[PDB]
């Protein structure tokens, strides 16, 4: 009477599924996407960052962003009823509270989406490997948008939910962290690139070693959760790649566990690296390379050339990307290559 | 009499590895570039990528490791010139001027083209369609654009990508400071193709592993896919065609940045009526690019 | 008496051995530079 | 320069490889 009627209404068949997980997902997901659209349409960044980042201020799709709060806010939650805005929606939109709105809602919407994957798999009666593969974007979101500012000064040093703000975030991690030299980052790059490489090779060879090309092509009945895996031959693909590459799969199960395994691991190792970079525990320098650079001043690798480029990124982007520090760098202290 | 014993040994698909007629070119070029890469990565003298006498020591025996070691590109004095060993005056003048880089990238680009040909060759011998060849053409075009096309447009082989882990990062940083690649849309299609390819790989993997129960081979292959989902067959063509055309786009994106038609500089988009310039997120990127561009002299 | 009937054997075939040796060797090739610094 | 950094690389190479090798030559004896 109380509970099983609501449970049978939620798990009922419909256009969209809305389980017990949908009550957490759909308000949080709808409000995160809507807060991003109403922030890039109307909300400025002038009082936090000193920038114009909305369509109302005359920006395109690339240069809009719902920017991070100011550095004097710290790691404050910035609630609408909180002690900073105090119910004022104008001052809440001006102080950067829309960023914390979108970030906390994206967190609970990702929680509700992975609960939705567990619920649909608990219905269909399958193993929930999609919710295990969705553990990697959740770990990337938690390590980047939550753990990295919580280890830094405040919410100001975080990705500011735009396209060009994301490109600024990549240049900031190159300049201030030397994040390309991090081995956890390199495992992340290798996981993503091996996944895309695995994606293209697998698609290329299922579409090639098909059972019926076109000549006696009896179109058999196809079901969608087999993801069309009846239609190709394992033996022809193993015979191809044992002679081309010298190594090939002979399982349809280990091949697809490998496609599950590679970019989730890649994405989990880059999460570990950004969690280390939250405390500025980065992989900046090789110490004996610094000693060899100090020993003779005619020693130059590509790494010591990269350190001067990170020095240039730092000292030229720093008075504008961090305007709360009030950096007054004269032209004589700025690093130039002809100096 | 003896030639047919060789024409039967080459063209046979009953080998361990298929050495085709493309393999006849593929094997000595990809062996020569491999042996010169191992030699010039372990033991190689310093190379001046500029035309001054301060050379870049990229090799392992000259104080590097696996991360910072590289095969340094050719000098600015050479440019787009063909530089084999007999063109040089001595062996030391060849090694000082970045001749191993030209040797490695020419034999690598020749052997990877014959790798694409050997893939198509075996496919035709096995009675298969030609798609694998096509899909390997996207990292092949991406390697041709980064070693040949961008040096042709910039006018020197010093602007090619170095053959090291830290040299790739130096290439990327210097390319962004010169060209603003992040706002170039053909690069953004490359990021969308690579991100979507990893996404569809993990998603396609997880959705199959969870819906595959048993599969055997007599040693007539059998598989019992646990079907029935909740509330044509072109999933694998989309799976190949998303990451491929994404990498194709960014390959011809840096091939158009070769000829200096580069990115998108939204330089002072927003303004104030007092003759004041209000910055955006583009000015911070352009402010950083001026950081790395000035340090590159 | 009974020897705790649970001791199932451990398998590790040769292709698992090759994959684990590739993982350990490329992890050492990646992290050796940072251990040597 | 680390003197004990070479031990870390040798202990990282050897210790999981000795586990995999013992596991393989122990599974070929009776699988």
């Amino acid at each position: 009477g109380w509970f099983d009627i609501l449970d049978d209404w939620l798990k009922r068949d419909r256009f969209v599924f809305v389980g017990w997980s949908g009550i957490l997902l759909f308000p949080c997901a709808y409000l995160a996407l809507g807060g991003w659209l109403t922030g890039t349409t109307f909300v400025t960044s002038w009082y936090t960052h000193g920038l114009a980042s909305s369509y109302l201020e005359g920006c395109n799709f690339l240069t809009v962003a719902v920017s991070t709060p100011a550095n004097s806010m710290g790691h404050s939650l910035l609630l609408l009823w909180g002690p900073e805005a105090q119910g004022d929606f104008t001052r809440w939109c001006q102080l950067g509270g829309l960023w914390t709105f979108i970030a906390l809602h994206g967190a609970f919407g990702l929680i509700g989406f992975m609960l939705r994957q567990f619920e649909i798999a608990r219905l269909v009666g399958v193993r929930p490997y999609n919710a295990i593969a969705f553990s990697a974007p959740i770990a990337v979101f938690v390590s980047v948008f939550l753990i990295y500012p919580l280890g830094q000064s405040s919410w100001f040093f975080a990705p500011s939910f735009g396209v060009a703000a994301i490109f600024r975030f990549l240049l900031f991690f190159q300049g201030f962290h030397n994040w390309t030299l991090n081995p956890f980052h390199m495992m992340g790059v290798a996981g993503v690139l091996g996944g895309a490489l695995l994606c293209a090779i697998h698609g290329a060879t299922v579409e090639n070693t098909l059972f019926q090309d076109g000549e006696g092509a009896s179109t058999f009945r196809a079901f969608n959760p087999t993801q069309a895996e009846e239609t190709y031959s394992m033996v022809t693909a193993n015979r191809f790649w044992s002679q081309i590459f010298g190594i090939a799969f002979s399982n349809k199960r280990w091949l697809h566990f490998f496609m599950l395994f590679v970019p989730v691991t890649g994405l989990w190792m880059s999460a570990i690296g950004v969690v280390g970079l939250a405390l500025n525990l980065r992989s900046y320098d090789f110490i004996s390379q610094e000693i060899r650079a100090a020993e003779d001043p005619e020693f130059e690798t590509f790494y010591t050339k990269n350190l001067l480029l990170n020095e240039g990124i730092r000292a030229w982007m720093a008075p504008q990307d961090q305007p709360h520090e009030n950096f007054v760098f004269p032209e004589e202290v700025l690093p130039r290559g002809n100096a | 009499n003896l030639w047919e014993r060789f024409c039967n040994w080459v063209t046979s698909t009953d080998n361990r590895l298929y050495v085709g007629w493309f393999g006849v070119i593929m094997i000595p070029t990809l062996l020569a570039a491999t042996i010169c890469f191992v030699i010039a990565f372990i033991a190689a003298p310093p190379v001046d990528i500029d035309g001054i006498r301060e050379p870049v020591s990229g090799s392992l025996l000259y104080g590097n490791n696996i991360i910072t070691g590289a095969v340094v590109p050719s000098s600015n004095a050479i440019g787009l010139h063909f530089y084999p060993i007999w063109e040089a005056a001595s062996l030391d003048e060849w090694l000082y001027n970045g001749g191993p880089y030209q040797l490695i990238i020419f034999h690598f680009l020749l052997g990877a083209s014959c790798y694409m040909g050997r893939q198509w060759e075996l496919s035709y011998r096995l009675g298969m369609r030609p798609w694998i060849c096509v899909a390997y053409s996207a990292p092949l075009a991406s390697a041709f654009a980064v070693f040949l096309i961008y040096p042709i447009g910039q006018g020197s082989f010093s602007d090619g990508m170095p053959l090291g882990i830290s040299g790739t990062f130096n290439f990327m940083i210097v390319f962004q400071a010169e060209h603003n690649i992040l706002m170039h849309p053909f690069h953004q299609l490359g990021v969308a193709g690579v991100f979507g390819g990893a996404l569809f790989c993990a998603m396609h993997g997880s959705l199959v592993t969870s819906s595959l129960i048993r599969e055997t081979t007599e040693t007539n292959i059998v598989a019992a896919h646990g079907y029935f989902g909740r509330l044509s067959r072109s999933l694998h063509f989309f799976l190949a065609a998303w990451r491929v055309v994404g990498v194709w786009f960014a390959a011809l994106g840096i091939s158009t940045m070769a000829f200096n038609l580069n990115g998108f500089n939204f330089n002072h988009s927003v303004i104030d009526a007092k003759g004041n310039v209000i910055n955006t997120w583009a000015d911070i990127i352009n402010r950083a690019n001026l950081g790395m561009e000035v340090m590159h002299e | 008496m009974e020897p705790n009937p649970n001791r199932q054997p451990v398998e590790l075939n040769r292709t698992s051995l090759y994959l684990g040796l590739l993982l350990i060797l490329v992890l050492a090739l990646l992290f050796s530079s940072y251990f040597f610094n | 320069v680390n003197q004990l950094g070479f031990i870390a690389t040798a202990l990282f190479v050897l210790v999981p490889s000795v586990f995999l090798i013992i596991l393989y030559v122990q599974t070929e004896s009776q699988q």
Partner: peptide, 27 residues
Amino acid sequence: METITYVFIFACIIALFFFAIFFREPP
């Protein structure tokens, strides 16, 4: 000692490639 550790790990990787292509496990 520092260089030869890198060359030793790389040579063991090439030897593993040789043992993986030609001494592969039969089905």
